[PDB]
Amino acid sequence: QRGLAHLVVSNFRAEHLAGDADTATDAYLKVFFGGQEFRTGVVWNNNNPRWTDKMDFENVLLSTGGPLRVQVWDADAGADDDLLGSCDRSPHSGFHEVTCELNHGRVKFSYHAKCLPHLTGGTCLE
């Protein structure tokens, strides 16, 4: 098997978000890779939130396991929550910092994709 890596996504924070009409944003993130979904907790009333989450996607395929997707949401009453923006990146081996510009503000995070032993290259194919 080729294209395998250990993917870890962390250092989540966002700036100048706009999620409510009368108060500050109540943001949370949904992060997706290879059929797995992780959701952070909510940071109430803060347009510049930071989260302590470290998401370990275990052994994944950087070649074909779809993009790494980060959705920025604002918490309201659940079913009526606001989707503030979404970002897609095709992860590559090594350490990488990501900045996704949204309609208002931006979301930032880092990821480290380490090829599994015997594998090398941008997508661990070699």
Chain residues binding Ca ion by CB under 5 A are 19-20, 23, 26, 45, 74, 76, 82
Strands (E), 40-80: 55-61, 68-74
Q: Which CB atom, from 53 or from 81, has the smaller least distance to Ca ion?
A: 81
Query: For Ca ion, which residue has the nearest CB?
Result: 23
Q: Minimal distance in Å, beta carbon 12 to Ca ion?
A: 18
Site of tokens 């500050």: 24
Q: What are phi and psi of 106, to 5 degrees?
A: -160, 160
Q: Minimal distance in Å, beta carbon 105 to Ca ion?
A: 14
Q: Which CB atom, from 75 or from 119, has the smaller least distance to Ca ion?
A: 75
CA distance 5 to 61: 6
Token duo for residue 29: 């993130």
In this structure, the number of other CB atoms found within 10 A of the CB of residue 123 comes to: 22
Q: Which CB atom, from 10 or from 86, has the smaller least distance to Ca ion?
A: 86
Q: Minimal distance in Å, beta carbon 101 to Ca ion?
A: 20
Q: Which CB atom, from 55 or from 74, has the smaller least distance to Ca ion?
A: 74
Q: Look at the alpha carbons of 85, 98, 112, 94 in this order and tell me if their dihedral is positive or negative.
A: positive
Q: Minimal distance in Å, beta carbon 53 to Ca ion?
A: 20
